[PDB]
């Protein structure tokens, strides 16, 4: 059974690196992405990466967050950098083969558990 298991911190003033260890299926062919759900029920696109190591970023988060995939250990990493207090939300590790996708939440057919990141000030 495919279990996208996330890790990383959940409270910071600072930088962070929220990880996502996959298991049960080799996702090298698949596109592994990162989303964000604030209170307001809107899964916002943050970062994705294709099989050809191509970084797709949301316009609100371009240049700040850096995505990296480890194709041998079957994982995706999101390097959090310059954390404004508006980043207090839940980060979902997605993994799909986006169809009408790379920005649509309903194209990724595997999901992480979630990571409550709290950025106070």
């Amino acid at each position: 059974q495919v279990q996208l298991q996330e890790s990383g911190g959940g409270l910071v003033q600072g930088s962070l690196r929220v990880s996502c260890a996959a298991s049960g299926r080799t996702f090298t062919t698949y596109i592994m992405a990162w989303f964000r759900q604030a209170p307001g029920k809107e899964r916002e696109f943050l970062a994705a990466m294709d099989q050809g190591r191509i970084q797709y970023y949301g316009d609100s988060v371009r240049g700040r967050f850096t995505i990296s995939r480890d194709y041998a250990k079957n994982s995706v990493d999101l390097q959090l950098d310059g954390l404004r207090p508006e980043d207090t939300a839940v980060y979902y590790c997605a993994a799909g083969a986006g169809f009408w996708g790379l920005r649509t939440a309903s194209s990724y057919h595997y999901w992480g558990q979630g990571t409550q990141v709290t950025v106070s000030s």
Binding site: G52, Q55, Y56, G98, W100, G101
Partner: peptide, 26 residues
């Protein structure tokens, strides 16, 4: 052919960062 999706990305090659235009075909 249902439709296309146009996006843009960035590689990290051994030589450096390139701008990669991207069109998907669903």
């Amino acid at each position: 052919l249902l439709g296309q999706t146009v996006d843009s990305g960035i590689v990290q090659s051994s030589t450096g960062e390139y701008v990669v235009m991207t069109t998907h075909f669903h």
